[PDB]
Design a protein around this nucleic acid. Structure first.
Lengths: 241, 174, 125, 96
RNA sequence: GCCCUGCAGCAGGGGCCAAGGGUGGGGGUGUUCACCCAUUAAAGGGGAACGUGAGCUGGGUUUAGACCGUCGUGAGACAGGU
RNA sequence: AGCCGAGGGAACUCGGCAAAUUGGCCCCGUAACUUCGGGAGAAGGGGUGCCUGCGGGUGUGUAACCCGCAGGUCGCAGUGAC
RNA sequence: GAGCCUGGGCUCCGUGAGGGGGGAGAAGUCGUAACAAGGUAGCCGUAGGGGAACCUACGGCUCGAUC
RNA sequence: AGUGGCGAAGGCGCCCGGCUGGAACGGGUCCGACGGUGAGGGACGAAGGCCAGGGGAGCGAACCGGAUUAGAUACCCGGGUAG
RNA sequence: AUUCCGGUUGAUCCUGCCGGAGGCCACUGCUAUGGGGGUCCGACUAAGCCAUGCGAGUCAUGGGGCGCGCGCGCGCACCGGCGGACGGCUCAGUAACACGUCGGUAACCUACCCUCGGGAGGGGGAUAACCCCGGGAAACUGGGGCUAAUCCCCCAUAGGCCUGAGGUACUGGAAGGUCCUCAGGCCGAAAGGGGCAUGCCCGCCCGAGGAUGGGCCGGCGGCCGAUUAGGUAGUUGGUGGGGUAACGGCCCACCAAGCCGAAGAUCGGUACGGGCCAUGAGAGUGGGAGCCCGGAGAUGGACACUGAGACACGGGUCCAGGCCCUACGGGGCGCAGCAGGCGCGAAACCUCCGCAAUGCGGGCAACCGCGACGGGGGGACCCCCAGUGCCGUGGCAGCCACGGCUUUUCCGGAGUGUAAAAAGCUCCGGGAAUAAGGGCUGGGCAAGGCCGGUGGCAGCCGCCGCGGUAAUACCGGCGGCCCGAGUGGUGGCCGCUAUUAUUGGGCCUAAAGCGUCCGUAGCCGGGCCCGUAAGUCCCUGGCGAAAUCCCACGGCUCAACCGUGGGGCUUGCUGG
């Protein structure tokens, strides 16, 4: 019987969001707790080794990681268990390479190459709000991170808006609201990786979440949940998809 | 629960001692130079699988249905059992002799590289026959349509010389 | 040991057979019978599930009496009319809901001393 | 199953047949129960003796039961002291 | 304590002297004897008014009550049982 | 005519004769068999003093008779003898 | 709150003087009840009787032959 | 006296009088789907048998007799108890 | 292949059962050349007992100190820190919110990890190693002296918790929640340490949140038994409290009389649950050891300490039952971990090599450790591809003589391969030589009317039936047929079986209508109109892990196998 928490993970039990061979071996890297969830993230060693192919074993990957040759959100990361997730940026400055992490229409995560200019911005989705001592407002974002704001400007930040921020120094620019003409990118569900504009919102009673309708530029309509609709622009995108 | 076990790819008859089946299988075994009944039975099973797929797909409505239809027809054209302008009803007229004609032993005989089917089997198994570029040693390989013209003798093989005694004895037939 | 985890009978009235041991999470502890003191106050400290802390009162001398937002620290005389058990008034045992005399008058206890370490009471009108 | 021989006997064949069928009583080693077993072959009873260990199978019959013209017998001898009766009767092996 | 032996020893069998001491406990039965158990050095047999009721007991037996079986016409009897 | 007797417990005797054991009240729990009325108090088990208090029933009742519970304490023993 | 002892309930197994019927098995003894109107037509139900198949009485059925 | 009739079935035959149940026919009469089957449960139910009380002609299990028979615990005959 | 055949008669048609003929699993007889892949091998009886060796460690950049060489460098142990609660084994118990699925916690905990906002002030102490002296058969262990810390303690400040009165800034579907102000009180932090260097690396404490992992609750769903019919007495609820991390008869005091049940309670039997598997045309029947997710247990049973987490397989205490060492005073152990052994049985392997790959813990890192994992050894475990010669002439009826050829396989060797090996792959030399059996032979059912022996004996036989002196049915010889590195025997499941029948059976005479009626639940119910929209139908959102199943493409010679993608499966739940 189990007397405590788990520390291993088998390959047949790994999430579906990964590009991994499940029968080659028995063991997989269990990620460490961190910003994103388990169903929405992949460790760094798999990126270094199986996606880009800069190493064939794990010793080599650990060795490159322990020398600051790879960044995530403008920060150095030496832990091969750190979970990388959606809207995050992987940067190798020794090769001039910058990738943005996004899902497919299938539900798996990939690497979309971008430029050095767009590598310095990261969008965030406001997921909740709190009042903390000193009478200040704390925004709880979608990667599990947090931001502080003054009381005077509380009405400008709500629980589904999007905020663009310089990544390392973490300064805000270009808030984006949730309205009936905003651009959207779906992150989970059956309609993942689709994109379009908002049309209508719908609420329901006693615990059931809110729904939203969207129109793609071919003219077709589709519904999904409101917490799955990432806002990235007003009329056109601000990042590359 | 119970886990997976690998299963046979050939079927046996329901009764072992019926005169008609015995006679037919005897004739086929003799005229195609097979070693056992397993080979005959597994070719027959291939046929039956094709035939069941056709019977299922026929009159099934959707998108995966037509996808699978086209897949089946293209697979058959590639194997060499159907022409291009074919339809799903041309499958049910196929027989086992075609599957038996699509194997290396028979092709090596019909091409003039061997005097007999047994000689062709020996050549294949000893490694004197080449496909497009390769050495294959399995007389039941089910040659494709684009390879039937790339079948020759291997560079390292005595038969690859035009003056070999046995190769001359082989060309003496034609 | 105080198990405090599950019942060995179904509502229908049938019997149940424990399929596993008594876990440690499920356990309980023995009660603090907070008494009126004579010389001092007594407090115990207890480590708990997640590495946390509880404070037990065993003997009490002082209470915080509230009358409309203004608090005073006074003493505790005889206990009166505990509506939860007959013997508590006699033994002078303090619980939530108990009525106590102080230098001022009668007051009702609004706290749980076996969980908090203090006796907070509201004065009667 | 396995057991030890105690008694060698002969049984009458049912009607309308006339013959003696050779059998032995066998005391099992699992449970100690005594059963009866038929010895197949021409002369299979001479390759057997008391206190020999012998292995016991079903004889083959309707509903796992008596077969042909010897009812009352459900079992059959297969091996004698870890050798096979077929071989002992054909003459290819010997009983240690 | 001794003698003969078909007494090698351990023992057995048969006989002579010897009456100082010992020879017990339990099971069914009213029993005496007889039978049985476990021990023991061995667990002898007899007499004394079948020693001993002005010493005890009171199971058996032979009164007066009653039951069964047999015998008898019957009243009734039984060295037959309760 | 009566009281106590270590260790064993019917070895006593025709026979457990005589003596001893149990013993009041409350609660729990009680077989075979049965003429379904009984057996049955079957059997078997736990409790029981004094003090300080709290409640209930009838009643106008700090009159009277009855019924439940907690805590404290003493003794080898609380239907303490009868 | 283990273990130990004690009583009760439920349940599985082994055994026991003697007796009961069942099923098989070459050839035995006594009868001759059922199939033909089987030599008293057969059979259901209830009751009584007899070495045994069986026999009688009351009520029924035809799955009973002859005219 | 019927190959007939009434009754849920078992079963019901002299005549007259009284009480009572159900069906068919005829019907521009009344209500307006109130119906079918029915686990479990209930009511009726030949003969024979039992309990309690009466009665007892004929027939007649058991029983007893005479015959027939190798025998006859039976068929046949004469008597007879329950019923 | 949506299938039939033999058997009751002198002969016939029926019913109905027995057998044959197909597949999968376990044991087993005879026989056996070679490779590849794979989730195979003490599960069934004994969750029975275990000799030996291994299965959990790491940090010297936390601290003081000893030794060996030139303050520096190497090595050992000690204190201290994190981990040892994962992984690995098994199927006893359990008919249960244990499992599956949908939801919930506004009723809760969380060390390692991420983000943000803030802090590191002032004092004290001991004690291992080291030195002296030891005791005890051992296991273990005493006294004195000296010393340090990221060891221990204390003050302060932050902060944590309770209560009362107000304000209404936040989230949310909805505030016993968060924020602001006041008041009365209990508990109460920290290592600016280490390294490089003339600031950078690794770190300590508080708070708000998340992630990871868990605890608790609910609706639906899935065995048999009436020769088990009434059960329950903290039992069902309420008021007030205790206790828990937290709701709760979880426990306590008081008031009531409720709770479950023929739509089968209670009791008894068997049994880890699912994804899955076998079979069948399908409906359906049956099973659930091996791989994954969940649960439970560590000789039986009970109880506790330390820790974020245990009532803790390789840590503790006791009772029972077993065993071992002893100097007889006393001590120690439980393989359902890898191998190995005894015992039980019809029934299951080497006391091997390695941390190179995949992963875990520790560590700034380099790196160390791991019977997990990987790699070989033994085995008729399952699947895929092959071999035991080919050609021509002649003679017979597949064989023999003759003359040539090839080398899969075999014998020997060089490379590559591999952690090291082995095997496998490329090449070279030799040489048709190095390699077929098992069952059957009367009908069912394919194949002998041939020969010798036995003579109602001996024996065969799924069933029918042979054998009593010319035996096509026994035994053997010679021939022949089925499958073929396999072929036969025993037992179990599905199918055969429309012999369990929803699809889809039957009840005058073959098994089978209650003796007949009236009626409770329940099932089935006349025609038109209006309404609702619960069942039913369509469209769409969120869920039903992966492996397994079907198809196509691509990579290992093809294949089996692996990978990319597209579909189903998940017997369904839920929002519009």
């Amino acid at each position: 019987a189990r007397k405590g928490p788990k520390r291993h993970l088998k390959r047949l039990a790994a999430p579906t969001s990964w590009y991994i061979h499940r029968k080659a071996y028995k063991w997989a890297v269990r990620p460490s707790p961190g910003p994103h969830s388990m169903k929405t993230s992949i460790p760094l060693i798999y990126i270094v080794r199986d996606y880009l192919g800069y190493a064939k074993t794990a010793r080599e990957a650990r060795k490159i990681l322990n020398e600051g040759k790879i960044l995530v959100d403008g920060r150095v990361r030496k832990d091969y268990k750190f979970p990388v997730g959606i809207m995050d940026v992987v940067s190798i400055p020794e090769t001039g390479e910058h990738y943005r992490v996004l899902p497919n229409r299938i539900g798996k995560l990939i690497l979309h190459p971008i430029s050095e200019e767009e590598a310095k911005l990261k969008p965030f989705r406001i997921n909740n709000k709190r009042m903390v001592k000193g009478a200040k407002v704390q925004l709880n974002l979608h990667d599990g991170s947090n931001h502080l704001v003054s009381l005077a400007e509380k009405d400008a930040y709500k629980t589904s808006y999007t905020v663009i921020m310089q990544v390392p120094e973490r300064q805000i620019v270009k808030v984006l609201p949730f309205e009936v003409g905003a651009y959207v990118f779906v992150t989970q569900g059956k309609n993942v990786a689709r994109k379009g504009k908002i049309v209508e919102v719908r609420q329901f009673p006693m615990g059931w979440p809110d729904v939203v309708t969207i129109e793609d530029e071919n003219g077709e309509l589709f519904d999904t949940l409101k917490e799955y609709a990432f806002v990235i622009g007003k009329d056109k995108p601000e990042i590359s998809l | 629960g119970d886990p997976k076990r690998q299963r046979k790819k050939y079927e046996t008859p329901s009764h072992p001692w019926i005169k008609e089946r015995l006679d037919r299988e005897r004739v086929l075994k003799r005229n195609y130079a097979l070693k056992n009944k397993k080979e005959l039975w597994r070719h027959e099973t291939q046929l039956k699988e094709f035939r069941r797929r056709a019977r299922r797909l026929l009159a099934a409505r959707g998108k995966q249905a037509e996808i699978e239809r086209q897949q089946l027809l293209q697979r058959l054209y590639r194997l060499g059992l159907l022409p291009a302008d074919a339809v799903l009803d041309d499958v049910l007229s196929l027989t086992v002799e075609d599957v038996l004609e699509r194997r290396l032993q028979t092709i090596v005989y019909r091409k003039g590289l061997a005097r007999t089917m047994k000689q062709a089997r020996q050549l294949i198994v000893h490694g004197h026959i080449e496909v497009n570029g390769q050495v294959i040693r399995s007389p039941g390989y089910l040659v494709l349509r684009e390879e039937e013209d790339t079948i020759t003798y291997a560079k390292g093989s005595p038969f690859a010389k035009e003056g070999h005694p046995e190769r001359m004895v082989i060309e003496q037939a034609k | 040991a105080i198990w405090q985890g599950r019942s060995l009978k179904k509502p229908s009235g049938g019997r149940i057979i424990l399929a596993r041991k008594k876990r440690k999470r499920e356990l309980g502890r023995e009660p603090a019978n907070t008494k009126v003191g004579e010389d001092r106050e007594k407090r115990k400290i207890i480590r708990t599930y997640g590495g946390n802390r509880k404070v037990r009162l065993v003997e009490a001398l002082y209470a915080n009496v509230f009358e409309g937002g203004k608090g005073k620290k006074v003493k505790i005389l005889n206990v009166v009319e505990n509506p939860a058990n007959r013997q508590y008034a006699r033994r002078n045992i303090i619980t939530k809901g108990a009525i106590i005399e102080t230098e001022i008058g009668k007051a009702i206890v609004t706290s749980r001393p076996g969980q908090d370490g203090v006796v907070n009471a509201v004065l009667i009108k | 199953a396995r057991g030890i021989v105690l008694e060698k006997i002969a049984v009458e064949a049912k009607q309308p047949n006339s013959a003696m069928r050779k059998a032995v009583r066998v005391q099992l080693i699992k449970n100690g129960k005594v059963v009866t077993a038929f010895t197949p072959g021409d002369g299979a009873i001479n390759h057997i003796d008391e206190h020999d260990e012998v292995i016991i199978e079903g004889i083959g019959g309707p509903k796992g039961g008596s077969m042909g013209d010897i009812p009352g017998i459900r079992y059959k001898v297969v091996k004698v002291n870890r050798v096979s009766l077929k071989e002992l009767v054909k003459g290819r092996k010997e009983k240690p």
